[PDB]
Amino acid sequence: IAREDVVLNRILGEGFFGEVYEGVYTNHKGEKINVAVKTCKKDCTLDNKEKFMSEAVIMKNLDHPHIVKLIGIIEEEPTWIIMELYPYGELGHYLERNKNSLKVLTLVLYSLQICKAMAYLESINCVHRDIAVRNILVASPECVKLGDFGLSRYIEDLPIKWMSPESINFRRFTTASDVWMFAVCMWEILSFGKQPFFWLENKDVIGVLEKGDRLPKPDLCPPVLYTLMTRCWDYDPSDRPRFTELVCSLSDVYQMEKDIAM
């Protein structure tokens, strides 16, 4: 991709490394595609440059239907990472807007799509750390895509309401802590974008969990899905389901629900 094929139109915001813009990419076929363009401060360390490109290389290579797509990378030295932009926007707002017309089948499907992307990351022992409806983008009513990795992976040695006990307490982040967090995101999806522990302050959260308390069953949540969430919320990471098993349970629930609705 040539720099002249991307035109920047406005500031989108500042991310962890720079300097993120909204732009238009023009295809070799001539199609105009809307894009986000992440940049890295030219006035920054060796190491941040490294990390900003490391992130670009992961997103480039994941190439998963339920992970947000990288369109290209301009390496030369005002570096642009060109990401696909999704005008349906964030899942949480999408679920809010559409609560009155969405069916449970659709929410199970979204949960299943994110689970598959996670099982892929799990296969390569790659920890995402940011599995939340605010960080998932609606490509189409048929397709959701998990967003950017949690930036804490770039900080040398917080979404507290989404995090496992060992993450909060001990800064531990494993595929197992991602499973805990995935189930919170499913809770959000089955609650139409409701924020987890919305009645608590961040400091309250660890106390409630130690006492064995958990997020309640969303009203429209299939019981099977709630007991599945409750297994993900085991204090013991090793007692938690792996994403591969989650993918099988969710597919089973999807096929069950699909028959129910037709």
Identify whether the C-beta of residue 140 lies closer than 8 Å to the C-beta of residue 65.
no
DSSP character at residue 90: B
Amino acid found at 70: L
Active-site choice (63, 130, 252, 259) = 130
Give the CB-side neighbour count of residue 71, counting CA atoms within 13 A: 25
Query: Has 178 been annotated as catalytic?
Result: no
Dist. CA 144–CA 112, nearest whole Å: 10
55 in a labelled binding site? no
> What residues contact residue 253 under an 8 Å CB cut-off, 6+ apart?
108, 222, 224, 225, 228
89 in a labelled binding site? yes
**List of domains in the chain:** 1-85 (3.30.200.20), 86-258 (1.10.510.10)
Tokens matching residue 195: 């924020």
12 in a labelled binding site? yes
CA distances from 248 to 134, 140, 241 (A): 25, 24, 11
Our measurement of the distance from residue 184's CA atom to the centroid of its chain's CA atoms, rounded to an integer in Å, reads: 12
CA distances from 257 to 83, 119, 127, 224, 251 (A): 34, 22, 30, 11, 10
